[PDB]
Structure formats: C-alpha cells, structure tokens
Amino acid sequence: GSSGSSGNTLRELRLFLRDVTKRLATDKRFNIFSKPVSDYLEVIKEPMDLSTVITKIDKHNYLTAKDFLKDIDLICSNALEYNPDKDPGDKIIRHRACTLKDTAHAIIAAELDPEFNKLCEEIKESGPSSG
C-alpha cells in the first residue's frame, strides 16, 4: 500500500507548467521571447525560447518545478547577451526580460504549493526521468 503514486503528481506538473509558459508565449506582450531575438541563429551559445520549452514538457523532461523555472531564467539572460543597442525599441525589451522572470516565478511560487513542490522532486530520486 504505497501512499498515492509518482504518476499522478507528474501529470498535474506536465500540464501545469505547459499552462504557464503557454499563457505567456501565446500572449502578444510575451511574444518577443517566443522567438530568438538575434541577427544570427549561429551566434548564440544556449538558444532558449518559450517554444523549445513547451516541447520539453511534452517530452517528459520536466519532472520538477525548479528544472522548469531555471529554463525561464535562461531566456531572460540570453536576450541580453546578444542584443542591439543605440536603437529605439531596445530600452523596452531589457525591462521586459525582467518582467517575464517575475511573472513566471510569481505564477509558480504562487500556485506551486510548498508541499507539492517537495513531492515532484522527491520522485526525481526514483522516477526514471533523466537530466
């Protein structure tokens, strides 16, 4: 009699996260990050976009919440790594990047309960999921 199972916990997660990133990407305001804002795709070292993320969730890659957030904080950093300056429209993005992190992190820290988070991770120990 194993209290519950390490299967239902994931489901809610897989769908949960995907729900967060989706809302953002889908939303226009958060569409500038949906694509690689660079002049050359062969200039970025770690290309991360809300697009490639939605895939990871559908590929059973995100078994925890932290592994998901860390991916969101990567899109904000890069956006700054390679970005044009001295042009009308950049001063905004820079600010937007930060806004994203806060929002996404707000939805997680707000929704993701302190008891549910400790679980999704407690499973990463047994669960076959890799990293």
Curated annotation (Swiss-Prot):
Report the residue ranges that make up the Bromo domain in this protein.
8-111
Taxonomically, which superkingdom? Eukaryota
| S-S bridge residues | none
Localization in the cell: Nucleus
Oligomer status and interactors: Binds acetylated lysine residues in histone H1.4, H2A, H2B, H3 and H4 (in vitro).
Family statement drawn from the similarity comment of this UniProt entry: Belongs to the AAA ATPase family.
According to UniProt, the name of this protein is ATPase family AAA domain-containing protein 2B
Full protein stretch here: 958 to 1080 of 1458
